[PDB]
Amino acid sequence: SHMMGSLEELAQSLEELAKSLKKLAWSLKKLAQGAQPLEMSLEELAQSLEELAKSLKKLAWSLKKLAQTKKQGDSLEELAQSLEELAKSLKKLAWSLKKLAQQYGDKRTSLEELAQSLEELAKSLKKLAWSLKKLAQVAPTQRHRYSLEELAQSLEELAKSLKKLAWSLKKLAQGTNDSDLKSSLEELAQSLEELAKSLKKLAWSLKKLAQG
């Protein structure tokens, strides 16, 4: 009911985020056309973003299968695997971002902090996957309400971390002036903010389910 709707809203927000990442990848490739140094690092960062976008669309499909359906346990484990794969792609993205930042001056610090934030996000997603694999081994009617409330809290903390990431990308955009890079960064920030909202709505559905 409300759970299926919250899971599908989240999958939709993940697919929109993937599209914003693909736009940013294109901006970075155009930046790599020779009008500024560090062509190779820009191209590598662009490729990592396209790989991140592919992992997000795989995660969205996993959520859609969960929303549509005794097979609940299997679907949760598939979801946890997709999260672990997304975490790996985030760590690779952070690695490429650090390499790019080595080429900048005043901007190097904000780019390095951004990469550190992605590394912390990856760690939080691995912990979420672990919690989901635990839940998957408990029959849905035997799950403790506190197990559901802890999951909702974890999603609310993830939303806060994405809003902080969005704020840092907005500040980066203000300092930029690319081609359409500024517009691609602002759009990405808005997609992360929408994702954070969809995570808060899912947390609400879990807290509602915990009360039942």
Author numbering: -3 to 65, 69 to 176, 178 to 212
Relevant lines from the article:
Using the experimental apCC-Hex structure as a seed, we designed short loop sequences computationally to connect adjacent helices to generate an up-down α-meander structure. The sequences and structures were named sc-apCC-6-LLIA and sc-apCC-6-SLLA, respectively, for single-chain antiparallel coiled-coil proteins with six central helices. As the peptide assemblies were hyperthermally stable, we heat treated the cell lysate (75 °C for 10 min) and subjected the soluble fraction to immobilized metal affinity chromatography (IMAC) and size exclusion chromatography (SEC) to yield highly pure proteins in a minimal number of steps. Circular dichroism spectroscopy showed that all five proteins were α-helical and hyperthermally stable structures, and AUC confirmed that they were monomers. Moreover, DPH binding suggested that they had accessible hydrophobic channels. The outlier is sc-apCC-6-SLLA, in which the experimental structure and model differ at one of the Ser–Ser (g–g) helical interfaces. Such polar contacts are notoriously difficult to model. In more detail, for the antiparallel α-helical barrel proteins, sc-apCC-6-SLLA returned partial matches within proteins containing four-helix bundles. Thus, the success rate for making these single-chain constructs from the seven antiparallel designs test was five soluble proteins (71%) and two new α-helical barrel crystal structures (29%).
